[PDB]
Design a protein around this nucleic acid. Structure first.
Lengths: 111, 100, 53, 92, 73
RNA sequence: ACGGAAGGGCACCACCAGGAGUGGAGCCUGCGGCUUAAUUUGACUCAACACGGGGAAACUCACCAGGUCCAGACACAAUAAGGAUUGACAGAUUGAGAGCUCUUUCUUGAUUUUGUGGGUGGUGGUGCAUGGCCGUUCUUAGUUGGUGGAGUGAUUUGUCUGCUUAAUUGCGAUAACGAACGAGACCUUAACCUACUAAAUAGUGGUGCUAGCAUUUGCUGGUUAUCCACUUCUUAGAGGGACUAUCGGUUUCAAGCCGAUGGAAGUUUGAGGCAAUAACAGGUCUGUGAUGCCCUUAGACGUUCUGGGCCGCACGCGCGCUACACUGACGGAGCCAGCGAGUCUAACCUUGGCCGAGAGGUCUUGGUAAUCUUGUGAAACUCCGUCGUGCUGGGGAUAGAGCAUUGUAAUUAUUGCUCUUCAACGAGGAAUUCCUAGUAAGCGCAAGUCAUCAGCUUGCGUUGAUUACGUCCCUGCCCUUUGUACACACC
């Protein structure tokens, strides 16, 4: 239905949209990054971060309503989007995590 | 059946290795096929202003997007196609199946 | 109320706008991204566009 | 808050069933996505709800995510007068 | 706010607030008896027994068809 | 920092040499002046002025002449379902059902009409908050530690005596040695990967069928499966290159600069991207929903509609286009480009016929895209004729009539076309602009805004005469010497 020329740009725009939404709504919770995996009738998105349990929340309601978020946003099939959380290895080697930690320290209020 | 497995990726090395493993699996399965034909890689160019407003010398930038298309002509049943796709999997590689 | 948008907004720069700042100038419709030029400059690295030449 | 009864009931039931509202920022369109009510009416109702403090909002490039909270869901439950374990919004 | 002299007449016309008159809906006056029902509504299927066919000066109005009602006798 | 102060080191954004319009004419563009309701804006030494991709129907501009709408929220008292807006035909307005607005009514009918320290919005304003991004710094040119040495010290040497090099890149280095960043380094469109797979998007030798020449090797074309080791025109990959090979001339015979039986060239292989510890009160609270601060929240500076407006002329300024005529206007005819561009609540890109000298659509065995435009038949050449030592045939600019289109609207001609009328322009006075390659330029295509077409911008196609190694006179920069009474540090 779409030529691959516009389709690649559309996929890039969708990935940018998911990354920007996650970093805007998850700045307080220490978001680091997102990766994707496409398979027939299923799209897995994995959030690389530090506090996997905290971004999971209580009974995973956070991830359930985030999946519903991405669903109602991008108008895919119902229930074909699944997100997981993974603890980033070498956490301090990413500038985003260091920036988030410094934001937290500034909020605490040390020199 | 004359199926066409088409890869529409951008990762050059990933496209090369996935084509290599597909062709090597076809060779080791000893089934007739056509060679992996590469469509010429297409460059998407955006010429945009370096600066937001109209200050400074007229300077522009050319963003580039290299996209690689390739296809292999096979003849396999649905189960064999699914097993081929499942084996040698790599995220990001965009695969699609057509029948001629 | 149907009297608020009596003047057509089906085409033109009134509708051909970006999804970030809703502006109608400096827009690019190539490859159907419909993004402002400077926002594209900001987000091109993550979108996929890279600076080579 | 000056919503019709039908529109407010539709918004409440959609929040109960899905949990989150997505509203493309186009006011006075009077044709909202997947709900027949007004886009401006939905936006203003949810903004007044946020002022009440029962639901949160995100922008993300003129897109209006409306995400419900515990206080919002409990107030909606008390308004709809639904029995416990009838249809929670956090199903798997 | 320099090129605005307001030479036009002062015409603030904030909408009226539906001044409350005396009792309305005068069907008839019957003492210790049934008051007959009036205002036979329009036979058009669009009307849902909600339009009051008040004939002030030889005219009829229907709130259902907001754009199509033009009848004469 | 400042020099008309020592100097040197450089730059075709400067020259000895030489080409190409600008300064003389006609036009769209952008800036200052004027009028007006409004022609509102920001930007002014290279670092304003076809710049905000900003060619201005309306939409996008903020500027106006007018009538409508709130998103007005902590908590209530006052007429409190004998009750209050948004959606209404009507004497009058109106592109209209904007009852916005009077004696009279309504699709629904607690969704409260009013007030405060909170404040949701804004093209109202400050780069006297600035992020963030660019330009200039600084375009092939400059900085920083560690250990030594000078110095009480701040600091200095290191980072140059002699100097090749479109870079302090380097040989050699006086007290230095040893590292780091910028640079150098990192790369296809710019090939020949003839080791190997590569287009029902390819070839010739013959392969089935064909029109014409002697039944004197066969020839161009066709529908596509009607073929037989293959990649000679275009993409790749663990791995190719040219490292200025090898020699002759100049250097206490030490970097380098030059000429020559071969590969794509032996000036660094072509152009660019990413990019110097620091600065500019350089552009953007005025196309960005980064946002405290003085501005609004019952006629609001937000939004919506009609008509105006970046579209006006006594005037000056630079970018760009057309000329000054056997080269060009020409016309009837031959043969040609690479990156790319193009349809899902949209039916888009002008492929062969009908309404039709052409322009809108009526059928899509062409399009999720090298095959439909398209292998981009245009841009420059060859038979023929006029301007034939011109007050006009170069100049369709300088005016009117008509023939044509998405668009619920194009009048101060949105754009093309068919005619009719050359009021300017004979290498163009002082100043300045850009250029060594296959470069400026002779000339047309692709994409941006698009409803229409650019002259603007980012990318190619036929070729170029005599330097490229050579200096400050003006356009300047840098280093170190030198002089200070300077620190928001010559403003």
């Amino acid at each position: 239905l779409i030529s691959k020329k516009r389709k690649l740009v559309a996929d890039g725009v969708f990935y940018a949209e998911l990354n920007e939404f996650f970093t805007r709504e998850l700045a307080e919770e220490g978001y680091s990054g997102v990766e994707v995996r496409v398979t027939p009738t299923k799209t897995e998105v994995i959030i690389r971060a530090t506090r996997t349990q905290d971004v999971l929340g209580e009974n995973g309601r956070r991830i359930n309503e985030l999946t519903l978020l991405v669903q109602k946003r991008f108008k895919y099939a119902p229930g074909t989007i699944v997100l997981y959380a993974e603890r980033v290895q070498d956490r301090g080697l990413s500038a985003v995590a260091q920036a988030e930690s410094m934001k937290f320290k500034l909020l605490n209020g040390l020199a | 059946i004359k199926i066409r497995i088409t890869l529409t990726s951008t990762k050059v090395k990933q496209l090369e290795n996935v084509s290599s493993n597909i062709v090597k699996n076809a060779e080791q399965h000893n089934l007739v096929k056509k060679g992996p034909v590469r469509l010429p890689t297409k460059v998407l160019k955006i010429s945009t202003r370096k600066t937001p407003n109209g200050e400074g010398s007229k300077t522009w930038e050319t963003y580039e997007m290299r996209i690689h298309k390739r296809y292999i002509d096979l003849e396999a049943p649905v189960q064999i196609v699914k097993r081929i796709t499942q084996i040698t999997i790599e995220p990001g590689v965009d695969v699609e199946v057509v029948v001629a | 109320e149907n009297v608020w948008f009596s003047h057509p907004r089906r085409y033109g720069k009134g509708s051909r706008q970006c999804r970030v700042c809703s502006s109608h100038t400096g827009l690019i419709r190539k490859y159907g991204l419909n993004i402002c030029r400077q926002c594209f400059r900001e987000k091109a690295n993550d979108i996929g566009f890279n600076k080579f030449r | 808050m000056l919503m019709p009864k039908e529109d407010r009931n539709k918004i409440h039931q959609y929040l109960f069933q899905e949990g989150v509202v997505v509203a493309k920022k186009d006011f006075n369109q009077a044709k909202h996505e997947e709900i027949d009510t007004k886009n401006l009416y939905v936006i203003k109702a949810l903004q007044s709800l946020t002022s009440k403090g029962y639901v949160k909002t995100q922008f993300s490039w003129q897109y209006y995510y409306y995400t419900l909270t515990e206080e919002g869901v409990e107030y909606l439950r008390e308004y709809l007068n639904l029995p416990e374990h009838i249809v929670p919004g956090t199903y798997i | 706010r320099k090129k605005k002299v307001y030479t036009t007449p002062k015409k603030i016309k904030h909408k009226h607030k539906k001044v409350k008159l005396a009792v309305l809906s005068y069907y008839k006056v019957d003492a210790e008896g049934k008051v007959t029902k009036l205002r036979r509504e329009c036979s058009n299927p669009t009307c849902g027994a909600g339009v009051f066919l008040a004939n002030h000066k030889d005219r009829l109005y229907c709130g259902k068809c907001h754009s199509v009602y033009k009848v004469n006798a």
